[PDB]
Homo-oligomer: A and B are copies of this chain.
Amino acid sequence: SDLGKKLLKAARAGQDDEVRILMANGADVNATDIWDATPLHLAALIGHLEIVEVLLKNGADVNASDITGTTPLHLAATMGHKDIVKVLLEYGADVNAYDLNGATPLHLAARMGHAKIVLLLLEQGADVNAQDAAGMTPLHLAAANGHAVIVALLLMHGADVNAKDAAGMTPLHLAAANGHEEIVILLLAMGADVNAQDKFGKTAFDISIDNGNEELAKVLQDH
Contact = CB atoms under 8 A, between A and B. Distances in A.
B186 A149 contact: yes
A153 B189 contact: yes
B119 A189 contact: yes
Nearest to A157: B189
A18 B68 CA distance: 73
Q: Interface range on chain A: under 10, 10 to 19, 20 to 34, or 35 or more? A: 20 to 34
A186 B116 contact: no
A109 to B, nearest CB: 12
A119 B185 contact: yes
Main secondary structure of the interface of A (DSSP, over half): helix
Nearest to A122: B189
A152 B149 CA distance: 8
B149 A185 contact: yes
A116 B182 CA distance: 9
Contacts of A152: 148-149, 152, 155-156, 186
A192 to B, nearest CB: 12
Nearest to A186: B149
Give the one of A148, A155, A188, A189 with max B CB within 10 A. Answer: A189
Contacts of A149: 148, 152, 182-183, 185-186
Contacts of A153: 186, 189
A220 B163 CA distance: 33
Contacts of A186: 115, 149, 152-153
Interface string A188-215: 1110000000000000000000000000
Query: Top 5 A-B pairs ranked by shortest CB distance?
Result: A152-B152, A149-B182, A115-B185, A148-B148, A119-B189
Given A116-B219, A153-B186, 8 more contacts: A83-B222, A115-B186, A116-B185, A119-B189, A148-B148, A149-B152, A149-B182, A155-B156
